[PDB]
Amino acid sequence: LVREEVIDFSKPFMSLGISIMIKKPQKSKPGVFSFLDPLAYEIWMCIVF
């Protein structure tokens, strides 16, 4: 608005906005107990029961 009050703007030749930039997700170091990952925690609990 401030600029438009002193100069004439054409229509937007390219539209943009505010966006979020994050580091690309990468392979995570396996956890100590990652060998339980294939089954859900509920499966293990019900197996014990």
Partner: protein, 98 residues
């Protein structure tokens, strides 16, 4: 299959493990300060009272902070610049959400 932690604005708003920041002085800063939308209200509240300060001197500093933070920092910036940086080496950053 690698899944990003953040997928939208509200995802950033909900969590607190990942910090986010903008330029110290720029259009994004005023947009967040002056906003009237609850999600951006809570983002502005988090950002203004963030210790240490999440704001950066320049865009390059924000990009470097994102790259070196091991995914614990998210930079809010123009979509065009975000896309451009995403397509440049070392190709370790990407744009999320709308």
């Amino acid at each position: 299959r690698m899944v990003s932690p953040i997928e939208s604005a509200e995802d950033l708003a909900k969590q607190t493990e990942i910090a986010y920041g903008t330029l110290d002085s720029g259009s994004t800063k005023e947009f967040f300060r002056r906003s009237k939308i609850a999600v951006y209200e809570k983002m502005w509240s988090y950002m203004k009272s963030a210790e240490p300060s999440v704001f950066t001197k320049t865009t390059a500093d924000g990009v470097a902070r994102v790259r070196k933070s091991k995914g614990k920092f998210a930079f809010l910036l123009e979509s065009t610049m975000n896309e451009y940086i995403e397509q440049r080496k070392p190709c370790d950053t990407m744009k999320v959400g709308g």
